[PDB]
Amino acid sequence: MRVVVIGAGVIGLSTALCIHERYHSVLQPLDVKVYADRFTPFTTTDVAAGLWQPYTSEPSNPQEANWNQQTFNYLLSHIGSPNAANMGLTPVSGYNLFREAVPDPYWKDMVLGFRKLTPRELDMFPDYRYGWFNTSLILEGRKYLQWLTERLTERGVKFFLRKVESFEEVARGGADVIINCTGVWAGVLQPDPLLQPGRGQIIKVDAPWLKNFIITHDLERGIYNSPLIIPGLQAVTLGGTFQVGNWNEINNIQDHNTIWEGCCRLEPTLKDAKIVGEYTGFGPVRPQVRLEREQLRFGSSNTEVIHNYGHGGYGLTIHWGCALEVAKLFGKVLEERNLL
Amino acid sequence: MRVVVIGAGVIGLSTALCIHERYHSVLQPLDVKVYADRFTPFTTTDVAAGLWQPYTSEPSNPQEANWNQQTFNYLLSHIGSPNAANMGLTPVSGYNLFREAVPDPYWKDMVLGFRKLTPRELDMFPDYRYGWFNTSLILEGRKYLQWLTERLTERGVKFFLRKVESFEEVARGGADVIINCTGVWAGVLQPDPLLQPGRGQIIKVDAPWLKNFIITHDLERGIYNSPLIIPGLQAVTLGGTFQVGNWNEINNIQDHNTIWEGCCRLEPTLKDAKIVGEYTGFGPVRPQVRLEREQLRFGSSNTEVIHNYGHGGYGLTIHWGCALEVAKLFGKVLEERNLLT
Ligand SMILES: Cc1cc2nc3c(=O)[nH]c(=O)nc-3n(C[C@H](O)[C@H](O)[C@H](O)COP(=O)(O)OP(=O)(O)OC[C@H]3O[C@@H](n4cnc5c(N)ncnc54)[C@H](O)[C@@H]3O)c2cc1C
Ligand SMILES: Cc1cc2nc3c(=O)[nH]c(=O)nc-3n(C[C@H](O)[C@H](O)[C@H](O)COP(=O)(O)OP(=O)(O)OC[C@H]3O[C@@H](n4cnc5c(N)ncnc54)[C@H](O)[C@@H]3O)c2cc1C
Ligand SMILES: C[C@@H](N)CCc1ccccc1
Ligand SMILES: C[C@@H](N)CCc1ccccc1
């Protein structure tokens, strides 16, 4: 059984680890390899704000809510462990701010200590009238990617920096199963018109006095198109743009200003914060996560492909539940081949 | 009106600023000076973990509860301001942990979002089975001392290196009023056997991933004799000793160990944290804060002294209320000389 995972972002590596941890002990031989054209720190995952929080509306697919919950429980469970921080993981509390009353989110009971903000808390944020408090987790993309690659490597999973031109090529080269974790670029290997890029730009800043996340919403502009502040492990992420359809990989002057003055008015102490870097990444926006089997016919055999892409602006939030589901589908593939 | 404040720790500079802001306008010529033999970063204040939280038990002087609350509201009112962090101030959330159920603290409604901990929160901290969550404020001693000294300076308040040897000496040199903010050493200038040193040792550590304060309690060993973790503005403070009666200024090995491994057990990610410094300071422990007027006679003239010392392990938590009370007592000194507000 030769399995090639394509993609070395959170989705690819989490899935690779999940498959391997689950089947190494019971299937000889199992050969899992990762192929990608960019590894940390050059993936969208590396640019992620680094916080666990789903969108404010339910998902179309009710499986996604579960995947989000499994991910939180998976991540929470690590708190107490000596290596939580070396995985990119720590607990944070913070605020969600609104210009008007809004319904509770479906995830209110998944986080810790969810409640509405009292009138007294609201005076800390003059521009907003209603909000939430809760405790969630930081999950730093960059650090988590380094952790997962060390955990994969020690288990004998090999990485190959290479650009896949088609599913065909990889199958022809000896893959029995392909796990497709190519993120926003999946369309290059199989056209998918529902998949769009969600261009997000961020400013990273040294401001270690900030201990809380602060996320504002503007209902008339779409999600994450409103200032947001997320303290990371060593730096702070400043955001406020997320526009679908825009394929420009370069930083832009307007979004820089939108992020900087939006965040400087939210958190005026930002005046003394040193800019550390400024980045742009593309969320794999899709009305729903594509996570499914597909049978491909080349040469003399079927090669099974399992897709796992289209996680929009919530891939870190939802990744573990998605990896588990892919390992399930793999298991079905195995019994069909009378392998276990 | 020549006022000498003795002390440049949080209590001293607080009170100085507060008097000055209240009475500069209505009283020329007001001349406020600060005398001290230790300034930042060599004051007890500089060593303070930097968190707002009173003791778990209510104080013998209930006035201290209001002084804590005035302080919190005062500090809170600055959140939203561009300069909150330059003052040493930022909000933080965190946990108070107990091995058994305990009554709610009197300060539960002064903080933000106080509630009990749920079983799931308790799974983060194995050794413990009851506790609180809340939001409070960091007030870094070292930074707040610097902020206050810039504010005082630009108001024309002048600072002098001086080890005062008696109230007499200062009254002889021309002071009409003396504000005594000498912390744990007040007994040198007037014996006060209720005042004892509360030796506290800490390890400062580079661990910027830790965003929450974590304070454990051991109902039997007395307060702050249990591991505690408090993220500061740039570094993290680790503690766990608070020993009354002990005057040894040097760091010792067995308290280092008590702290380090007590805290490594609580927060095991601390294995990767670089040690940046370890320090020892003496909290001015007293059954209650001394904050009162006293008239002393030296030759022909009366000298007015207002004492403000004995703030134990809660001086930052309570300081603004105390400064405001000293300013009230100053007002009454004024009105006794038929001067007006
Ligand atoms: C600014 C910003 C902030 C965000 N913040 C958060 C957050 O705080 N929390 C959260 O949960 N989510 C966040 N997201 C969303 C999250 O970043 C994404 O959902 C996630 O990173 C996507 O993971 P992925 O592994 O699917 O894609 P990627 O991380 O892009 O990985 C794609 C991989 O596929 C490889 N690849 C693709 N095509 C090929 C090919 N043809 N041949 C070889 N290799 C190929 C690439 O080299 C790369 O290794 C954010 C997104 C942005 C843009
Ligand atoms: C390890 C530790 C951690 C702590 N953490 C916290 C915390 O998180 N929150 C909190 O609220 N409290 C905390 N405390 C308590 C807090 O540090 C004190 O309550 C506070 O610093 C007392 O301030 P002060 O100005 O009264 O005294 P100090 O800061 O000691 O200042 C005293 C001043 O008096 C001067 N002085 C004294 N005698 C003379 C003299 N004869 N002539 C001239 N000058 C003189 C000194 O030079 C100095 O300027 C902590 C204490 C310790 C030991
Ligand atoms: C709060 C996070 N779950 C999303 C943050 C984000 C996503 C896309 C662009 C900027 C920020
Ligand atoms: C939460 C703060 N009030 C810490 C106080 C303190 C006092 C003495 C020793 C260590 C810490």
Swiss-Prot record, chain B:
Variation of pH perturbs the enantioselectivity of the enzyme towards some amino acids. Changing H307L: Reduces activity. InterPro entries: D-amino_acid_oxidase_CS (IPR006181), DAO (IPR023209), FAD-dep_OxRdtase (IPR006076). D-dopa binds at Q53, G283, G313. Expressed in the liver and in the kidney, including in epithelial cells. Not expressed in the lung. Induction: Repressed in conditions of amino acid starvation in an autophagy-dependent manner. It holds the Pfam family DAO. Optimum pH is around 9-10. FAD binds at residues 8-11, 37-38, 43-45, 49-51, 163-164, 182, 283, 312-313, 315-317. This is D-amino-acid oxidase. Homodimer. Interacts with BSN (via coiled region); the interaction is direct and inhibits DAO enzyme activity. It comes from Sus scrofa. Its EC number is 1.4.3.3. It catalyses: a D-alpha-amino acid + O2 + H2O = a 2-oxocarboxylate + H2O2 + NH4(+); D-alanine + O2 + H2O = pyruvate + H2O2 + NH4(+); D-cysteine + O2 + H2O = 2-oxo-3-sulfanylpropanoate + H2O2 + NH4(+); D-dopa + O2 + H2O = 3-(3,4-dihydroxyphenyl)pyruvate + H2O2 + NH4(+).
